[PDB]
Amino acid sequence: NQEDSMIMNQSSIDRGLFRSLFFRSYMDQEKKYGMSITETFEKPQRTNTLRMKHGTYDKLDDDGLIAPGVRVSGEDVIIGKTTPISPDEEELGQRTAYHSKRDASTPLRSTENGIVDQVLVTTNQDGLKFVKVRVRTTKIPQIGDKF
């Protein structure tokens, strides 16, 4: 405890002294660059996209979102995005098929690992597809925390 450190009872931590929740959100939506056809919230498979990450996209669903209540590790993607351009010769040129991805998916932050809770989608100001998710984490006290 020298120089303001503290000794703290492990057993009180175990019983539940100073436990806490942690809520994080993310925001993403389709963008229109048209010739008005916009991006899509689909589930990117292997032969659709380019240079997509190793996030192991299995946690998503057919509508390109994750379900509430499942757990997520550090590198799991939560949102699926795909480039609607056109003009890029979008599945006929300067890429194989690998259809039209140029995948713009949003992975989770690289460290924390919570549980997906309360995902909603509603259109934005002008009318798009606009998504907010939320993930929830338990944060037990450890050595370095500051009181």
């Binding site: 405890n1 020298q2 120089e3 450190s5 050595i143 370095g144």
Partner: protein, 56 residues
């Protein structure tokens, strides 16, 4: 002043600190995570061949 005289580097770490009266002065305690991220090359000699083989 921001790219020549001083700069970003590599091979570094940054945490917070706490006391310990079971380390003598030339020692420092490092988390296993940090020591798993950082590294340091060694050249393979006759002397260290087995140890490095095991460690690989």
């Amino acid at each position: 002043r921001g790219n020549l005289m001083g700069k970003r580097v590599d091979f570094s770490a940054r945490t917070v600190i706490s006391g310990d009266p079971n380390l003598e002065l030339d020692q420092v305690g490092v988390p296993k995570s940090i020591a798993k991220t950082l590294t340091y090359p060694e050249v393979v000699t006759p002397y260290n061949i087995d140890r490095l083989t095991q460690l690989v």
